[PDB]
């Protein structure tokens, strides 16, 4: 099959087996410079050239067998970058391996990287750098076959200023002073498990660590270490449940890195070193499902990988499925259903936003000429989860379906697969229930836009109180506002308080007087919890409360998690009173934003 997001030679021509990265981080120039030595295996007879993906890279030279070789960079193809064709000195036979050493330098504008000044950090004394390769940004760090259909091991040596620490998506393999510059340190890394290149990750900063489990360190700037160790204390218990559900954890270490607030995602499942947003630091462990999700990716996504980005639901859907089972084991089956029903609500929201006929609402998408960052949404997570949860109910329950999940991980470990490979194995494992499987509307579930053709069965126990309070507020008239009181929330957990807000937000706007009363009785303005605060500010802005304008703008800019930043900017642009402020704020902050976040907020606000 064809990876339409890559310009490199496909896996049927050649395959990268290993990467040996030797680089230096220069904060003054905002460049990563070094050599990427690719061990490439030919898959064809008489192979004389190959093509690699690049994006805003400066190539100095290409060396094979100790000699410089001819290379050519093609015309840039927008978000795909520029193809780099390399002329091999000797024709290769099938299975023959060669080492190709590429000397490169990144651009300060690399879409994979964010360079932070000391002022943008917690400590204010040192700069900071972090990468984010998923989906197709690894090509903006180094020349590679930037496709999840190719898996490679890697070794790396990273030179950094001596007062800083480097970490990667690999096992730490020591540190020494740089033998070429005593003002620097070299940090060494080893990733012995084969991975797709989007899982390559680097962070350089004034980082400290604290042990929180037998195979877990939490890493962050000094200011966040204590809070992070507490917030993520359930990590080991989640790893033990995940091992029981998916089989052995093969990665050795499971560390966590708490990034600065501009980190654009909730979490990134980088092997050995999960990256997390500091917006999870709620103080009560209530946002720990993000850790359960990243842990689950150690099986679904990192071991069993989607062959192309069109089949991304395979990564997300199975991970959400496993994550909800972890939380189900820790908190109970009623909680798993509450989270599952919440997920259906988030799917309804995504489908309503794009429109029910939009191609991005399809489970399997055609990404030909589509930037994956633009296509990204809750759809592959929630529609993917909904399908598996529906199959679980159709096939005899969670115990039976978890047996299939474990066999699926074992079958496809270290491989890259498509929706057809998954479906085929599903039919094979469930051969005694093929009559049941033939009742599924596969064409609709996998290839049709909008809401799924069937809604699963959900226990309502924990959801009932959220729906009842939301309906009281929506149906309330002016003379009913007096009946609301802080006592309404006494029996609600933080998760139920969030679901109350999500239910009400789906019916927004509410009258301005109702929103004013909600602040008067519930004091939602005082809640620090990022998920609750975000839904509350969206509710205020959509209900046209001018007092919420500075609070929404502050939240949209003081952190950069796209889940929060994008809808807050969009809501502020849609409110007449704040439109000009939203545009101006984006324009002032654009140059100091994460490049992917800056691009997407620009598109949402229609500001070039
Ligand atoms: O833990 C996590 O999952 C976080 C990890 C960071 N990350 C970034 C990201 C960006 C672009 C992507 O591309 C695609 N989007 C779609 C949407 C629909 C169908 C196919 C595709 S392929 C995929 C992932 C995701 C959030
Ligand atoms: Yb070692
Ligand atoms: Yb009344
Ligand atoms: Zn994920």
Numbering used by the authors: 3 to 610
The paper states:
LTA4 binds to a deep L-shaped hydrophobic channel which forms one of two lobes of the catalytic site of the enzyme. The second lobe of the catalytic site of LTA4H is a more open and hydrophilic pocket, and forms the aminopeptidase activity of the enzyme. While less is known about the physiological relevance of the aminopeptidase activity of LTA4H, Snelgrove and co-workers suggested that it can degrade the tripeptide PGP which has been reported to be a collagen-derived matrikine and neutrophil chemoattractant.
As the unbiased approach did not yield a compound sparing the aminopeptidase activity, we decided to test whether we could obtain a potent aminopeptidase-sparing inhibitor by truncating an optimized LTA4H inhibitor, JNJ-2699313518, with the hypothesis that the potency against the epoxide hydrolase activity was not strictly coupled to potency against the aminopeptidase activity. However, we hypothesized that by removing the part of the compound which interacts with the Zn2+, we would be able to have simultaneous binding of the PGP and the truncated compound to LTA4H. Removing the carboxylic acid group of JNJ-26993135 led to a compound that was still a potent epoxide hydrolase inhibitor (compound 12), but also did not spare the aminopeptidase activity. Replacement of the piperidine-4 carboxylic acid by only a carboxylic acid moiety, led to a compound inactive in both assays (compound 13). Since most reported LTA4H inhibitors extend from the hydrophobic pocket into the aminopeptidase binding site, they do not exhibit any epoxide hydrolase specificity.
